[PDB]
């Protein structure tokens, strides 16, 4: 724990980057996380929401 002032910066940078990448498994409220399975059999004035 001597080098903690260097280590916590790299830890919070890597964990912020991992939290950014772990956002990529979310449809945010859609039916599925696949873009085409949201959009393309639904009518195009009603999948844009």
């Amino acid at each position: 724990s001597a080098l903690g002032k260097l280590q916590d910066v790299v830890n919070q940078n890597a964990q912020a980057l991992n939290t950014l990448v772990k956002q990529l498994s979310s449809n945010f409220g859609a039916i599925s996380s696949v873009l085409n399975d949201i959009l393309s059999r639904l009518d195009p004035p009603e999948a844009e929401v």
Binding site: I31, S32, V34, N36, D37, L39, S40, R41, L42
Partner: protein, 95 residues
């Protein structure tokens, strides 16, 4: 079979051409939900779960995600996350 005992006939281990089913003009409505009917011939599926029933002619708009009705709320309910096509045609000449 009618809507209290709606038939579930699953389809597996074959090649499903949906361009034949698209270009047939006998069907009245072709309401669809998941992924495009142009590329229905282009993708591959795990299961089909094809269904078969007869409704009233005014009960066409009950077959949607989250409707209300004695068909919808008491007999035959679709999920809100339903991915499929509704294929319907008139059967006054057969029933």
């Amino acid at each position: 079979a009618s809507v209290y005992a709606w038939n579930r006939k699953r389809i597996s281990n074959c090649v499903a051409d949906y361009s034949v089913l698209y270009n047939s003009a006998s069907f009245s409505t072709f309401k669809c939900y998941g992924v495009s009917p142009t590329k229905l011939n282009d993708l591959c599926f795990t299961n089909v779960y094809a269904d078969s029933f007869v409704i009233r002619g005014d009960e066409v708009r009950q077959i949607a995600p989250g409707q209300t009705g004695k068909i919808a709320d008491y007999n035959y309910k679709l999920p809100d996350d339903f991915t499929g096509c509704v294929i319907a045609w008139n059967s006054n000449n057969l029933d």
